[PDB]
Amino acid sequence: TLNLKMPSPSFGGSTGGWLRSAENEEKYAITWISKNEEVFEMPTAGAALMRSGENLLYFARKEQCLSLGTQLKTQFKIDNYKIYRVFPNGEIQYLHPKDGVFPEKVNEGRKAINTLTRSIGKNPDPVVVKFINKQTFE
Amino acid sequence: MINDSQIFIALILSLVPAVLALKLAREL
């Protein structure tokens, strides 16, 4: 579960943050644990102060969360971050890391989606799928 | 030369393609 009452980094605010679409379509949350108070760069621009302990931020896009995640990992060696999608109705999907392990590391249990049992040069010609719903890359 | 009567006949006749255009447009 997320925990909506988790505290946030210290930040004076900006105009780069989320707009109406975050309220009535979807927004994203990233949480992490830091050992110490530390300044980091907001993906919406500006310096913010990481609390020691738990940290919660909301963003409009998944890419903003992951961008921050990459910064946490690279600059601060924090790899305990979690990303969630938050709907207006209150529902919460956990997104990343999906199964506990980062996607770049092989993990048993995962199943191949969107793989093909051929090389790219063995796709059929467009004319063959003319007047049917198939694609050449299906 | 060309009368008011002749211009009105043209305008009335131009309703035929107008209506038919509407029908074709809809059918497409």
Binding site: - | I2, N3, D4, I7
Partner: protein, 34 residues
Amino acid sequence: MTASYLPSILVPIIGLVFPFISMALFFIYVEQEE
């Protein structure tokens, strides 16, 4: 009524009325959710 009146009647309609009705209809069409 004569024919020389026709430009003064028609040009305002083809230029200031027909287009704005067409624009309005197209606008309603493209925003319909159905």
